[PDB]
Structure formats: structure tokens, C-alpha cells
């Protein structure tokens, strides 16, 4: 049998879509499959997100897989919660509690705070992007008094904006005037090298810097010490290429034709794409046992049904929500288990450093223990 | 003929709701027909805001009725929804809420930015070392401005996010830690309610008045409970955009306190909040804009229909209404009212107040052109 | 209560004159709820009396 | 062969409860297995009765 | 050193309880949540009965 699901993909999430398609093949069986309906939307636009979500609700899907950003996360949480349709996502996890949301992405804040302590930093720059969100910066600032940290926070989201000259002045005052050499980069993974390149032109004795890349995909982009001007570089990784499950996946993924499967034919997979593939496993495990409702016809959705039709009865929707949250599987992102609010628990984040021979795992942070353990 | 507007009210906007009815009432009961060429109608919806779903539904409801503009409130959670829908449907949102961090269209923001005045006064007082306590209820703009200025001016700012503190002991622990750094000067960028809580812990502690200076960055100065702290010898600096000596404010108030508590709750058991004055001024700006469009024989029809209609084509009058709203120059309870291309107050005046052991007084004013002018 | 309802309702919109028909209890499950934005206007009118 | 259909109910609400009972009832069940608390007991036992 | 008095209607020495339990703890947590991470509640025994 088959179960209909929605898939809401942002422009530029090409590799994540390839990973979704590959997941659908991997986890389908002759006895059960998911039937996705894919919409492609501007996730920063809450009106467009509302239209997409409501169209999927209209079509009558068991769940919606998709993405949100800072500007649209409240649309997703409020609509999910009201209509009682589960939304499973690799997007940044929300600080608070919200029903009908399954967060594939482990929290990063805990591991980051622990890593700062592990290196015994007491003074550092924190380069953030306000459009990306400030939750992690806030966690660091909250801990700074107790931990004795002198943080200099700089919004590099404005590095090309009207606040651009202000941003360069800020970087200059911290790196040149105050001689800061410890730098945390909290940004989109594919923006790291662009920000670093700017830091290198602005600072001095840059070989002596130590960056922490505050992102769950340390090795998602090229890591070349030369690109970092010889500095130390540390970060986090949830996809462990030493895992047999992951290396087997990559053996298959690395030969997929790149035109047909955008973003594939690579030796690595972006953590968000890995989480997307894992989400297909989770939905498959959750749904394969649910009741085979009478085979109905699937019809294009009408967004207006958000206002015209009543919410899914809570008792109906909660069965699907609970099925998703009860899943326990191993995936590309390691051990996958959820708490009652759809947050990943019992996960492990690998702690990485860029060494002579390339990136190396130097330790790990487990959600149960919440400290950096050295390997 | 008849111009209808929408009114989107939130939790704790009762007095502003009353000020809204009353200002619309004043507009319609004006004898002079030159000043009142059309009748002004509105429909109100109350919204929770906890939910992006609840919010989209209330906006879309008002939208299908065919309103010519929306007066309303957003918070940090609902802002993206409301401004994105208003922007997509070319429908003008007129608000007393915190001005957006981003540059958006179709949002006329009645409340002036506070950051320019805060930076000028920090320079006037020569603060080079201070504590900065902040919540993010009114945006990240002030926080980001302070952090960057701290770099550019080499200040020693000790910054603490306190928007999540539920235990008042936490405020005392923070202050003690600041004591051990010999901090005497505090910039507090929080909601009035939270400023009140902090000032109260200051009083409980004792010996945190004389020799201390609190700069309270919130236009809600008159609702801050600071009398106990004033009596102990502290310096306090505050900010207002409402002058109670302004004859226009005087005239409003004298009528306002004569309204009966049934039709107009919060008019007699509470001093006037500055956001209520902004609500009144918002009706002045809407009236003026439509008086202008009429004068210019520009028409406006709508119909209107489904907010998620795809596409997705906004009415052409939309642009003219926005333009009409943003070009006004009127005098209101909050002084001179004008707007730039992003719907931000421009050429506004902020009055600066100083409380010292020698008494309380308006210490000067701030505008964009002359910055801080003491008298 | 009759005074309160009278004061609350006398100003509400005069919806198009419709026919009043015996009710069917099953409509609790067959028909959707009154849209909240509609019902809340009546609720508020009553509470403002 | 013994078949069943399950409904999950909040119980905070007498409305929510009546609806869940009536739903199961219209399917034509021969008996109901279930739980009540202090709030939902009267509804469920009165309808069953 | 307190005295405590308690009450039960389930005897774990009853062969019927024993037989249920031995099967029960072998069920997988996916189809049967709460069978392996929680001792059997007496209301679950009543549900079986």
C-alpha cells in the first residue's frame, strides 16, 4: 500500500531533493511506499509558505516533509499545531515546545557551549548572521557571565549590506585594535570560506587564529588550511564517514549521475541532505504499520481549504504524530530517537579539528552526558 | 464615500483599542466637511499571536472583507506572517509596534527607532564602560547597534540577555556579578514590565541607587515604576515622543478622560500609554492619506477575495495607498509625523528626560539632523 | 439576560432575512463550527454590555 | 473474529468526548472498551445508557 | 522503619499472570509501547481481562 505525503523544498535545496528521492527508493518495499507531492517555495515568504502548507493539507497528506527559516517557522508551528498535520524537517530546531513538529536536526547549542569550555576560551569573537537567527548567540551570551567569557558579537549577515561598512569597522576593531584571535563562525556552511577570506584580509598574524565553525557540517565544504591562512579550525559533524551505514551510502551516492541527481556524485553529503534521507526512513518506519485507509483519489490541493475546511480531528492526527515520535532507527545522522516534543535525543555530535592530513575526529559530545569527550 | 479599514488587535492592547475607536469617532464627528470627505469604517479582529495559523486566518478573514488598509499590532512571533502577507497582497499595515529590523514594503511604522537616540546619549554621557541588559521583544536592531559601536568606539560593554529570566534571584545574581566589576552604569533595553522587575530588585538589594545611572531605553517611560529608585539618589535617563504640554495632547486627554469606561475601557483607570497616542496618530495618517487620494481624484475599488488566490495578483490601487500613507506630513500627539520609503518615521523628535537627586526635567531633545541637543 | 442580549444585538449587522427551520442535533457532527471570527463578534458584543 | 476501532480523546472537554463517542457509535460497534475520568464519566455513561 | 499497608488484585504468582507477562515482555516496543520500559500497571491487567 501507499501513503501520500507532502514535500516542501526551498529554492537551492537541490542536493536535499536528490537525497529525498534516493531515500524514497532505498526505503520503499513491494509492500509499502510513500507517495510524495512536491512543492517548491520561497521559504522566507510566510504567505507562500502558508499557501504551500495549506495546499498539502487540502490534498489530505499523512505528513509534510519540508523546510522553514527564521521568518516562516511560526507559520509552520502554528499551522501544524492548529490543523493537526505533522511536519518533519531538517531545519533549525525551535527553542521552545511545539506539537506536530518532528525535528530531524539535533540541537547544536549544547555541544558549542561545551566546546568553548573544552578549549578553555575566556575571550572570543562571535560572528553571527541575524537573518539566520540569534538563538545560539543568545545561549552563548547567557552562559558568558557564569563561565567568565568576554564575547564580542558581530553580525556578519551585514557584510554585504548597508551595514557593510559598519560590519568591516567592527571586524577591524576586534581583529586589529583588540588583537582577537579566537573566532566563532555561526553561519550558513557554504558561507564559511567567504567570511574567512574577509577576516584574513582584515586581521593580522592570521596563522595564529583559532576558528570554531558553529555548524553541524564541518566537512560539507572544502577544508584547506591554506584557505584558512594556516589557522587552527574546529567544528562539529553528525554524519560519520567511518560508520558502515554512511560509507555504504556514499559508495552508492558517489556514482549517481550529477545531471539527473543534482548534488550527488560526491564523496560527502551535506548534513541537511543526510537528515532529509533519514527523514524518509523515519516516515517509512512510522507509517508502514498505520491503518490502510480506503484507497482514495489524490487531487491537487486548494490553499483556501485552510479556512474552508475544519482541522484534522486531534485524535486522528495525534496517532500519526506519535508514530513518528516513537521511531528508533540508525541513519546517516547516527542514532535517531525523539522526545515527546519531537526533538532528537540520545544523539552524538562528533568534534572535529583540521589536521595535517585533513579533518579528524578528536572527540564527541553525547546528548545524554553533555560534555566533550576526547578520543 | 465610505472607507473601511481592518483592525488587528492583540493581547494587552485594550487601551489602544479604545484609543482607536475614539480617534475614528473624532474623525467622523468632525463638523467641517472639508476635513471629513468620507466616512471611516472599521472591522476589528482579536488575535492570540501565539500561533502563525491563528494569525494567518485573522488576516485573511479581514482581507476577504475588502479593507483599504490594516491597523494593527505584531510581536516577534507574528511579525513575519503579517508583514509578508501585507507585502504580497499590496495591502498597507499601519502599526504602533516595534519598527521592523528589515526593510519591508507596505508597513507604515508609527513608532520611531530608538537606537540613534541611545547612541547619541551614550556619547553625551561618555559611557565607555557599562552593563547592557536586553530582551529581544522589540527586535535585534538596538542590540546589534550597541555591539558594533562597542567595537568601533572600544567600549567595555558587559551584555546580558535577560528576556528568559523567570526567577528574580537571577537578576540579583547578575547585578552582584556586575558589582564585582565596579559597574555603575546600566543601559536597559527591555519591555517596561521587565524593566519594572529589574528596578524592583535594585530596590530590594539596597545601595544600588546613589552613585548609579540607569538609562532606560523604552519609549514607555511614563509607565516605568521608578519612584523608589529616584528617592535613593540614582541618576535615570528616559525617552518620550509624547509631550504632555503639547496642546494637541492636552485636548485629546481632556476629552479622553471624560469617556465612559463601558464604551472605552482603560481610559480612566490607567494613564495613557504612548502606543495609544501612536494609535490615535495612525488614524490621523490614514485619514490624511485618503483625503489626499480623493483630492487627487485617484480611485480605489479592490472583490478582494481569497488571500491565497494563486496567483496572487495584488490590486493596482495598493501602491497608491501605500504611497499616500508614506508621503504624509501631519502633526499629532507624537509630534511631527513623516515617513521614508520603508515606512519608518523620519524627522521625528525624541524628548530626553533626566532624573537626578536634584529633581526631574526634560534635559533636551534628539532628532536625526541635530542629534542630541541639551538645554 | 433579555436586556443584555437586546443591547448587544440591536447594533449587529442585519444579515439577509433567511428562513428559520427546525434543528437537527446531528449537525453538531455534520456541520463545521461557526468561524471563530464570526462568533467572536457576538461574544464581544455581549461582554461589552 | 474480533475487530476494533480506536479513538483517542482529551477528556478536558464534554464536547470533545461526545463527538468521539458518537463517531464510534455511528460505525456500529457491539460494545465499547474505554476509560473515563471525573470530568468525562457522566457524558460517556449517559450516552451508553 | 514505617509500617505500610497496600492492596492488589493481581497476583504475580498466578500462572495466568506469569504466562501473559513472559509473552508481554517479548513484544517489540514499536507495535507495543510501554511493554518493556515499564512494569505492568494493574489497569493494563484489567484491560486484558
CSV table of N, CA and C in Angstrom, one decimal, chain B residues 92-149:
chain,number,residue,atom,x,y,z
B,92,UNK,N,-1.7,47.8,2.9
B,92,UNK,CA,-0.9,48.6,3.8
B,92,UNK,C,-1.2,48.3,5.3
B,93,UNK,N,-0.2,48.0,6.1
B,93,UNK,CA,-0.3,47.7,7.5
B,93,UNK,C,0.2,48.9,8.3
B,94,UNK,N,-0.6,49.5,9.1
B,94,UNK,CA,-0.2,50.7,9.9
B,94,UNK,C,-0.1,50.3,11.3
B,95,UNK,N,1.1,50.5,11.9
B,95,UNK,CA,1.3,49.8,13.3
B,95,UNK,C,2.1,50.7,14.3
B,96,UNK,N,1.7,50.6,15.6
B,96,UNK,CA,2.4,51.2,16.7
B,96,UNK,C,3.5,50.3,17.2
B,97,UNK,N,3.6,49.1,16.7
B,97,UNK,CA,4.6,48.1,17.2
B,97,UNK,C,6.0,48.5,16.9
B,98,UNK,N,6.9,47.7,17.4
B,98,UNK,CA,8.4,48.0,17.2
B,98,UNK,C,8.7,48.0,15.7
B,99,UNK,N,9.5,49.0,15.2
B,99,UNK,CA,9.8,49.0,13.8
B,99,UNK,C,10.5,47.8,13.4
B,100,UNK,N,10.3,47.3,12.2
B,100,UNK,CA,11.0,46.0,11.7
B,100,UNK,C,12.5,46.2,11.6
B,101,UNK,N,13.2,45.1,11.9
B,101,UNK,CA,14.7,45.1,11.8
B,101,UNK,C,15.0,45.3,10.3
B,102,UNK,N,14.3,44.5,9.4
B,102,UNK,CA,14.5,44.6,8.0
B,102,UNK,C,13.7,45.7,7.3
B,103,UNK,N,14.1,46.0,6.1
B,103,UNK,CA,13.5,47.0,5.2
B,103,UNK,C,12.4,46.3,4.5
B,104,UNK,N,11.1,46.6,4.8
B,104,UNK,CA,10.0,45.9,4.1
B,104,UNK,C,9.1,47.0,3.4
B,105,UNK,N,8.2,46.5,2.6
B,105,UNK,CA,7.2,47.4,2.0
B,105,UNK,C,5.9,47.2,2.6
B,106,UNK,N,4.9,48.1,2.4
B,106,UNK,CA,3.6,48.0,2.8
B,106,UNK,C,3.4,48.0,4.4
B,107,UNK,N,4.4,48.4,5.1
B,107,UNK,CA,4.2,48.6,6.6
B,107,UNK,C,4.6,50.0,7.0
B,108,UNK,N,3.6,50.7,7.4
B,108,UNK,CA,3.8,52.0,7.9
B,108,UNK,C,4.0,51.9,9.4
B,109,UNK,N,5.2,52.2,9.9
B,109,UNK,CA,5.6,52.0,11.3
B,109,UNK,C,5.5,53.3,12.1
B,110,UNK,N,4.5,53.5,12.8
B,110,UNK,CA,4.2,54.8,13.6
B,110,UNK,C,5.3,55.1,14.6
B,111,UNK,N,5.9,54.0,15.2
B,111,UNK,CA,6.9,54.2,16.3
B,111,UNK,C,8.3,54.4,15.7
B,112,UNK,N,8.9,55.5,16.1
B,112,UNK,CA,10.3,55.9,15.7
B,112,UNK,C,11.3,54.9,16.3
B,113,UNK,N,12.4,54.7,15.6
B,113,UNK,CA,13.6,53.9,16.1
B,113,UNK,C,14.2,54.6,17.3
B,114,UNK,N,14.7,53.8,18.2
B,114,UNK,CA,15.2,54.3,19.4
B,114,UNK,C,16.8,54.4,19.4
B,115,UNK,N,17.4,53.6,18.6
B,115,UNK,CA,18.8,53.4,18.6
B,115,UNK,C,19.7,54.7,18.4
B,116,UNK,N,19.3,55.5,17.5
B,116,UNK,CA,20.1,56.7,17.2
B,116,UNK,C,20.1,57.6,18.5
B,117,UNK,N,19.0,57.7,19.2
B,117,UNK,CA,19.0,58.5,20.4
B,117,UNK,C,19.8,57.9,21.5
B,118,UNK,N,19.8,56.5,21.6
B,118,UNK,CA,20.5,55.8,22.6
B,118,UNK,C,22.0,56.0,22.4
B,119,UNK,N,22.5,55.9,21.1
B,119,UNK,CA,23.9,56.1,20.8
B,119,UNK,C,24.4,57.5,21.1
B,120,UNK,N,23.5,58.5,20.7
B,120,UNK,CA,23.9,59.9,21.0
B,120,UNK,C,24.1,60.2,22.5
B,121,UNK,N,23.1,59.7,23.3
B,121,UNK,CA,23.2,59.9,24.8
B,121,UNK,C,24.4,59.1,25.4
B,122,UNK,N,24.7,58.0,24.9
B,122,UNK,CA,25.9,57.2,25.4
B,122,UNK,C,27.1,58.1,25.2
B,123,UNK,N,27.2,58.7,24.0
B,123,UNK,CA,28.3,59.6,23.7
B,123,UNK,C,28.2,60.9,24.6
B,124,UNK,N,27.1,61.4,24.8
B,124,UNK,CA,26.9,62.6,25.7
B,124,UNK,C,27.4,62.4,27.1
B,125,UNK,N,27.0,61.2,27.6
B,125,UNK,CA,27.5,60.8,29.0
B,125,UNK,C,28.9,60.2,29.0
B,126,UNK,N,29.5,60.0,27.9
B,126,UNK,CA,30.8,59.4,27.8
B,126,UNK,C,30.9,58.0,28.4
B,127,UNK,N,29.8,57.2,28.3
B,127,UNK,CA,29.9,55.9,28.8
B,127,UNK,C,30.9,55.1,27.9
B,128,UNK,N,31.9,54.5,28.5
B,128,UNK,CA,32.9,53.7,27.8
B,128,UNK,C,32.9,52.4,28.5
B,129,UNK,N,32.4,52.3,29.7
B,129,UNK,CA,32.2,51.0,30.4
B,129,UNK,C,30.8,51.0,31.0
B,130,UNK,N,30.1,49.9,30.6
B,130,UNK,CA,28.7,49.8,31.2
B,130,UNK,C,28.1,48.4,31.0
B,131,UNK,N,27.0,48.2,31.7
B,131,UNK,CA,26.2,47.0,31.6
B,131,UNK,C,25.1,47.2,30.6
B,132,UNK,N,24.8,46.2,29.8
B,132,UNK,CA,23.7,46.3,28.8
B,132,UNK,C,22.8,45.1,29.0
B,133,UNK,N,21.6,45.3,29.6
B,133,UNK,CA,20.6,44.3,29.8
B,133,UNK,C,19.6,44.4,28.8
B,134,UNK,N,19.2,43.3,28.1
B,134,UNK,CA,18.3,43.5,27.0
B,134,UNK,C,17.4,42.2,26.8
B,135,UNK,N,16.2,42.4,26.4
B,135,UNK,CA,15.4,41.3,25.8
B,135,UNK,C,15.2,41.6,24.3
B,136,UNK,N,14.6,40.7,23.6
B,136,UNK,CA,14.6,40.9,22.1
B,136,UNK,C,13.1,41.1,21.6
B,137,UNK,N,12.2,41.5,22.5
B,137,UNK,CA,10.8,41.7,22.2
B,137,UNK,C,10.6,42.8,21.2
B,138,UNK,N,11.5,43.7,21.1
B,138,UNK,CA,11.4,44.8,20.1
B,138,UNK,C,12.4,44.8,19.0
B,139,UNK,N,13.0,43.6,18.7
B,139,UNK,CA,13.9,43.5,17.6
B,139,UNK,C,15.4,43.3,18.1
B,140,UNK,N,16.2,43.0,17.2
B,140,UNK,CA,17.6,42.8,17.4
B,140,UNK,C,18.4,44.1,17.0
B,141,UNK,N,17.7,45.1,16.5
B,141,UNK,CA,18.4,46.3,16.0
B,141,UNK,C,19.2,47.1,17.0
B,142,UNK,N,18.7,47.4,18.2
B,142,UNK,CA,19.4,48.1,19.2
B,142,UNK,C,20.6,47.2,19.7
B,143,UNK,N,20.4,46.0,20.1
B,143,UNK,CA,21.4,45.1,20.5
B,143,UNK,C,22.6,45.1,19.4
B,144,UNK,N,22.3,44.9,18.2
B,144,UNK,CA,23.3,44.9,17.1
B,144,UNK,C,24.0,46.2,17.0
B,145,UNK,N,23.3,47.3,17.1
B,145,UNK,CA,23.9,48.6,17.1
B,145,UNK,C,24.9,48.9,18.3
B,146,UNK,N,24.5,48.4,19.5
B,146,UNK,CA,25.3,48.6,20.7
B,146,UNK,C,26.6,47.7,20.6
B,147,UNK,N,26.5,46.5,20.2
B,147,UNK,CA,27.7,45.6,20.0
B,147,UNK,C,28.7,46.2,19.0
B,148,UNK,N,28.2,46.7,17.9
B,148,UNK,CA,29.1,47.2,16.9
B,148,UNK,C,29.7,48.5,17.3
B,149,UNK,N,29.0,49.3,18.0
B,149,UNK,CA,29.5,50.6,18.5
B,149,UNK,C,30.5,50.3,19.6
